[PDB]
């Protein structure tokens, strides 16, 4: 184990939650992962370092940095904490304009279609595909297993292309069966 460092710049809009969630973020990194944690208030970037005498797992530093990045993108703390717990969790990321060049009201309505009324539509994809989705304006981030995120991605893409929520909800249910069956 060698002395190493990471630098993850947290955007301004995620600063206050980080101040909110700080009491629950350094314990797992400094105890279980045995890592040395800070941020530079001047640079507003959370700095994470491998402590050679105490850190033991070679992959802890990358695991911690990725855990931070999940929180930075907008994922809830408990959702991000799983990345520390597990080792096969990844983040899929893409924008609306990649699927279709939607502008003005068309872009806004496409976002509304993904989220659904009261967030129901996003939650169905969340539950059915066993993933988590953060919809940041036209920027979509999906966290989950590699097979799972691909399944969640297409349901989002179908909604972007114009598939009504109702039929997407039905397709999610057929997919939900095969997940429990396997």
């Amino acid at each position: 184990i060698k002395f190493e460092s990471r630098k993850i710049m947290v955007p301004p809009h995620r600063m206050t939650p980080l101040r909110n969630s700080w009491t629950k973020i350094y314990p797992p990194l400094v105890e279980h992962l045995k890592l040395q944690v800070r941020m530079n208030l001047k640079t507003k970037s959370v700095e994470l370092r491998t402590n050679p005498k105490f850190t033991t797992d070679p992959g802890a530093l990358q695991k911690g940095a990725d855990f931070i990045k999940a929180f930075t993108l907008g994922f809830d703390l408990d959702d991000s904490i799983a990345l520390l717990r597990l080792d096969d969790l990844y983040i899929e990321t893409f924008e609306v304009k990649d699927v279709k060049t939607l502008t003005g009201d068309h872009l806004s309505r496409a976002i509304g279609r993904i989220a659904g009324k009261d967030g129901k539509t996003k939650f169905a994809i969340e539950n059915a595909t066993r993933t988590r989705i953060v919809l940041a304006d036209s920027k979509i981030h999906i966290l989950g297993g590699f097979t799972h995120i691909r399944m969640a991605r297409e349901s989002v893409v179908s909604l972007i292309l114009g598939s009504p929520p109702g039929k997407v909800y039905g397709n999610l249910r057929t997919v939900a069966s095969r997940l429990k069956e396997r």
């Binding site: 408990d78 904490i81 717990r85 597990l86 967030g119 129901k120 539950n127 066993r130 988590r132 939900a176």
Partner: peptide
């Protein structure tokens, strides 16, 4: 069988742990 349309009380850590066990 009906799909939940609300935030899962289980964190994704917890649902994956259920998946292993």
């Amino acid at each position: 069988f009906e799909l939940s349309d609300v935030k899962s009380s289980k964190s994704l850590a917890e649902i994956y742990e259920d998946d292993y066990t």
